[PDB]
Amino acid sequence: MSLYPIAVLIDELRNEDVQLRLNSIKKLSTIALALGVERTRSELLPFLTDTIYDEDEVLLALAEQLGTFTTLVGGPEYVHCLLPPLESLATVEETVVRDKAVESLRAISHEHSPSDLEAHFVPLVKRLAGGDWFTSRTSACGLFSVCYPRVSSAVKAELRQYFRNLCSDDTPMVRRAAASKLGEFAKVLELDNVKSEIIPMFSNLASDEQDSVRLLAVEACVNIAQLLPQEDLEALVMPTLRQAAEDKSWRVRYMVADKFTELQKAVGPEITKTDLVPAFQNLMKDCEAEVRAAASHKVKEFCENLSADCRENVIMSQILPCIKELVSDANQHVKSALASVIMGLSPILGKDNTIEHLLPLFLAQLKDECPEVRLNIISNLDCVNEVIGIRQLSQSLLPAIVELAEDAKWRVRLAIIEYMPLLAGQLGVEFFDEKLNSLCMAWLVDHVYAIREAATSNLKKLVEKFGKEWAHATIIPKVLAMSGDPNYLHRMTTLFCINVLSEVCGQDITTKHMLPTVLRMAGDPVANVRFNVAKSLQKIGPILDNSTLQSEVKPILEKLTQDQDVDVKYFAQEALTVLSLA
């Protein structure tokens, strides 16, 4: 009993749940096609500025709609009309609704004319920055980077003083937001102005009272170093960066560690030896353990980007004496991060120096108590085999694969079955058949179905790596041998194997040794086997030629429709109608 569109849209706003309600707000664009171009401005838009207290999912879809609404108002000639309904959404209490509206504001800025830009959008940054509600003050920090170059040289000064008054605002929250968008601002100015205007703002933030401001200013330091010349780098950037690496809140010393690699690539090599390598030494051995794990994972990308005159030298004098002490600290987490990368050093070091000065420490990880350590050591060893031979280290992980393949907790056992195919292709066939076959075949009988599941699909890749014939030699005479196991779960495992292998074992094999095994099991007492026989038979069916479908599988499927078990019947009947058999 309502009236023209706006009312019928609000009648849906009083509906039960979100999706039912939200669905109409996604029609807010389609409603504006029916509405005249002006009707979208005259009637629609003013309703969307007196905001509506409502769930995030809707206000978010509302903000997205505004960022794609230029063509509906009449074109960029009237883009200024989208600003009021966005400013309100750039101030709602919920944070995500604010950033989405901000992003929509950053979008329609490009659509503004240079005259309309200075008269509508640039003032919009002021009302958000100078606004009382601290929420708007957060939103303002995100709109500076899109406008500052698009304006006149003088009004640029107003924005810089504005953005500066934001980094020194009383509220700590806005100081964070200003620190986050710092690099985006320094990136968007001229060269000489960032040296004098931004570096002050940058320093006072990296020494703030609240730790949340400190680390947020750090990640923006890289964005500054990407711009400055090498000379002015030690003069303005490093002073604050040097202290931030010693902040009593590990949250800060973590950021530089998680970004240590992104620093050297932007600061320079000689400055990496003057100031970075010194700090790295003390970061690998700082109090809170979380910081060490971060930097430990970055030992590889740090060594690689080092210059060529010292790559081999500074690693075995300033880096290694701290590595061994890391591998020997009881913190099971820090060694999990080192394990994934420590072996990426042999190609950077050499051949004689690594097997003699880098290998004996490697074993301590391969025999560590933590299962997660020796797991990561085994996935990142390809960078080792291309410098030192396989057997020089192959004869050592012999029991390491065993304890993981036979651990007491099944989560560990699964984790290594995923790495077996990668590991199989690096030891070749001659190794596997002698040692790694007794372990991989004992997985298809594991107590947990998850391992029997993984061990099944693990054979698909074990064939893709070795060849169609390796199954006919070491696998299939063993899989087919499980079909006599009493436990009906181990009996079914064969049927899941024949499904997988068929896809990657050609035709001549699925018909020679896999097909007669399936049809033999069609008389098992438990029906769980029999209806899966029909499932498997239709799975491998289209692989084999027609002569063998009409020969031995069809008489079974017809026979299986007479199994009183109602489950097989639907599957048996299904398995013929699936592939062109009555």
Next chain:
Amino acid sequence: DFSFGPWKLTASKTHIMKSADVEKLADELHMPSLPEMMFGDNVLRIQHGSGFGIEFNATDALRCVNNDWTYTTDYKGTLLGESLKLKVVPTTDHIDTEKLKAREQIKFFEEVLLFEDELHDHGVSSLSVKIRVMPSSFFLLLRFFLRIDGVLIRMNDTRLYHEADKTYMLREYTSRESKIANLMHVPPSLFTEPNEISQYLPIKEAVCEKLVFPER
């Protein structure tokens, strides 16, 4: 600003207190520091057709803070009247949960924040209050949340129930806390949403007071 029956449910919610107005009151209460976000003028009040009512603010909530950097407060409303007001008395009869759970016409609802503090990034201390209305009753809940990241959690809930036309309204103050070292079996993903973790916090203080209506 709502109105149902002989009641006047006033709604007030705005921005935080300015920086200068913080130190001014920080000395009025002799508090070395106020919350990071002090929602001073944010107030949720309900008046009667006679002159008395209850008010939930932050200023009176920060008075109840005793000799602190967590802003823990046992505030449960500030009795407001015009020399003729409602009385407080301990009681045996308390709120009945099976009633509210019943789905009825939701009349009005506004969540009103009182303060929030990030606790030097060591936790969160938020004091909020929300209230709904039913056709034959109104219900409110005032809850001070506290999460000291790595140490403990504390929730000081305070509910207010009034069956419409029932000469009295109820108030129950629940305050439960626990050091996380004792609730290891709880996933930390719930240390942020209070409505889901309150069940796993042991009661420390329970009080049920009935607020009575005078006559004239």
Next chain:
Amino acid sequence: KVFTKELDQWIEQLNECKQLSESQVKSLCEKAKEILTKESNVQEVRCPVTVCGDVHGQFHDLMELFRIGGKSPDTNYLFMGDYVDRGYYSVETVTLLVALKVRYRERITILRGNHESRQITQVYGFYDECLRKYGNANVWKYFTDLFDYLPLTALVDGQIFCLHGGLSPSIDTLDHIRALDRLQEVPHEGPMCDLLWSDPDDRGGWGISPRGAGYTFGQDISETFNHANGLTLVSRAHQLVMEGYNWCHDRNVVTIFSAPNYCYRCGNQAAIMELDDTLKYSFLQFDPAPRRTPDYFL
């Protein structure tokens, strides 16, 4: 009448942990009635099965449970009750195990637990959740009215007793159970209440359970019962064990709890029992699954 077209579809939606709407549950519980209406109070199930106990709306832990014993219908399953009332996804949990029964009348067998009743579902959570998920009690009525049709006990290969609670003094032979009327809300007394509320322990004879309803039986009871009807052991789940399964009464009765870290209380390991072709038992311990507005608030 291929209505199995959508039955399989519902399970795929339930395996993604997404609700079944009111109009959908109305039709589902209707079929489940016709399937359960024919099952005797003592439902006999064939030799090769996997038997699990309580789940309590711990859907994400039920899926972890499937990766242990096997997915359905590949694995013959047997549930001993308590599908709801202490997890967050009590709706999705029971909605799946019911749809699987309607699909595979023979691959799974679901029993009635002490929480499969309108009395208790209203306080421990199932009803409160059924509202938050749909906005009314219709779904709750559809399920609760169906819970009355769940069999009380189960009897594998003629040898093993499977129920939720324990034994009863009014019940000495299985023929007695087959004579009861199990089409009512779980009573407060009588043998039907005892079967779903009794618990075993060390103290001999009958005793007063601290939970009021049911009783407390020991070695002298189980021996005198199992040897009187020809049984190897009894399988019960109402309790919970840090070990997931507990042997008691000189291995005359086994407990099987299949909900790991029960409401974040004891971090218990959840276990299940697998019965291969012949009846040789083998348990499987497992751990929890790790993966991760205007409201009528209280």
